[PDB]
Amino acid sequence: LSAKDLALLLFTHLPGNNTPFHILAQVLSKIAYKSGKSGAFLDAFHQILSEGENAQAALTRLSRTFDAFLGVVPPVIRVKNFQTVPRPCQKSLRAVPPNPTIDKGWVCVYSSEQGETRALKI
Amino acid sequence: LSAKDLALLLFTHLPGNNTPFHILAQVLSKIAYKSGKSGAFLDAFHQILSEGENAQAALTRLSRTFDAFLGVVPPVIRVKNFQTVPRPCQKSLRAVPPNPTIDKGWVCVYSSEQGETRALKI
Amino acid sequence: LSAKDLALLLFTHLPGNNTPFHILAQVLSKIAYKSGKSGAFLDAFHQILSEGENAQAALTRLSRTFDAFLGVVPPVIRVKNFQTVPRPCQKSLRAVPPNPTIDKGWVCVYSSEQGETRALKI
Amino acid sequence: LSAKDLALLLFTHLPGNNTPFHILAQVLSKIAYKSGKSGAFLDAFHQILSEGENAQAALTRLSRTFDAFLGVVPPVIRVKNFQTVPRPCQKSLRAVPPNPTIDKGWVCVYSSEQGETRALKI
RNA sequence: CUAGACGUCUAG
RNA sequence: CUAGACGUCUAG
């Protein structure tokens, strides 16, 4: 199952659109796919849901416990400006810390044309 | 007190029409009735109200604490499509998780004519 | 300042006519006057406005914090039927809870000729 | 770019005539110009539009976030009477609060020939 | 203390 | 479309 199809599937479990969790779904999906852990990642995700957790709690937990995400630095996404970042994510932008990693809640790093950077934090 | 009468009574405490809480009222009433807990349920509902809680917070609380609802899987409701579902509920629809239970906020499972399913989440 | 004059003054700060907030202005003015807290009530109301809050936010806040309103049960108002209640208030009518008090958002209790009761809720 | 030209430019983005937002455009422009922020103001206005916001949402937002408007008291406008105020604005008139500021939605203060005052609220 | 997703109403 | 009041769920 491709990263795209994987991300879309996780989307069906999330409320709203273009939320920090949506971005996290895309990021975790891609990292999982490229690691060949696409199937295992999906299984773990559903396992958590069965425990009584919701999609959001599952993604945050997986980002902290799924070995494939441990120590992995958030991906850098280029954007005209920070106002280009999905609206529901804007208020979650922080200055980038020295060593950003996904297991620490850092979803991605936005880079503006002006060279400025902001990290999406959950 | 029948399920219908019980639901209609809860409706008088709820704002608007056909809200997720309206659906929850019906589900909870129906389950309570066939459990023989129709009376206890209503009493508990009034007790919570007397504590200062509103109707909405009372229903969600009951769904989480009332023993007759614990572990109970949400009922399946047939609909032509997901646009047939009451307006006020549509944006609260999500993919059905592995083990949906009412005590976890899952009101009901809608099934469409093409075998698709969406779960009402509060 | 009389309850009437007091209510009329608050009216000038409220948008529209015969809204739930208009009814609240009357109820709070009446209770305040009878308590001899007419002056204090008006002062607190303006103190809040100066904070940047609007009239509506001020009234709901006072109803929750102004000691003179704490634990006070909403006044019962007689009306032919619930259709007699001001239009703008009709959709805010709920069944009366066990222990209605103003500090809980309950403005007043409407009693119809048929003995039915509805509570105005903000 | 003078205050007049600036206001006329904002007008081209606004629906109808003599609406509360038209008055806001004039006030905000006049204040911006005198602050030497005429240019910055226009740029910010266009920036917001490019984000998907309409002219109306842009003005209200600027009035809340543009530093040149923070803490500024609405200007006083003389009128024969409150029926002389643009029709589209009349129903938005309210009693002047203790400390009216533009960043709180207060556009302007109208004063009549009888020494009476009303504030335009958005 | 942040933030996200809903629901109800009111005024223009 | 804009402004406001009330409430429900959730994540850090």
Numbering used by the authors:
A (entry chain A), B (entry chain G), C (entry chain E), D (entry chain C): 208 to 329
Question: From the publication, what sentences describe this entry?
Answer:
Filoviruses encode a viral protein termed VP35 which is important for nucleocapsid assembly, replication and transcription and also plays a critical role in host immunosuppression. VP35 binds to and likely masks viral dsRNA from host factors, which leads to suppression of RNA silencing, inhibition of phosphorylation/activation of interferon regulatory factor 3 (IRF-3) and antagonism of the type I IFN response. Here we present the crystal structure of the dsRNA-binding domain (RBD) of Marburg virus VP35, alone and in complex with dsRNA. The structures and accompanying dsRNA-binding analysis performed by dot-blot assays and isothermal titration calorimetry reveal that MARV VP35 RBD coats the sugar-phosphate backbone along the length of dsRNA in addition to capping at the terminus, suggesting an alternate mechanism of dsRNA masking for immunosuppression.
MARV VP35 RBD was crystallized in complex with a 12-bp dsRNA oligonucleotide. Data were complete to 2.5 Å resolution and the structure was determined by molecular replacement in space group P21. The asymmetric unit contains four molecules of the VP35 RBD bound to one molecule of 12-bp dsRNA. Interpretable electron density was observed for residues 208–329 of the RBD and all 24 bases of the dsRNA. The MARV VP35 RBD protomers from the complex align with the unliganded MARV VP35 RBD with an r.m.s.d. of 0.44 Å suggesting no appreciable secondary structural changes occur upon dsRNA binding. By contrast, in the MARV VP35 complex structure, the terminal bases of each dsRNA in the asymmetric unit stack with those of the dsRNA in a neighboring asymmetric unit. Thus, in these crystals, the dsRNA molecules together assemble one, pseudo-continuous dsRNA helix. The four MARV VP35 RBDs in the asymmetric unit do not end-cap, but instead, solely bind along the sugar-phosphate backbone, forming a continuous spiral of VP35 RBDs along the dsRNA. This arrangement results in a complete coating of the dsRNA by VP35 RBDs, with each of the conserved, central basic patches of VP35 RBD facing the dsRNA sugar-phosphate backbone. Each VP35 RBD–dsRNA interaction involves ∼520 Å2 of buried surface and is accomplished by direct hydrogen bonds between N261, Q263, T267, R271, S299, and I329 and the ribose-phosphate dsRNA backbone.
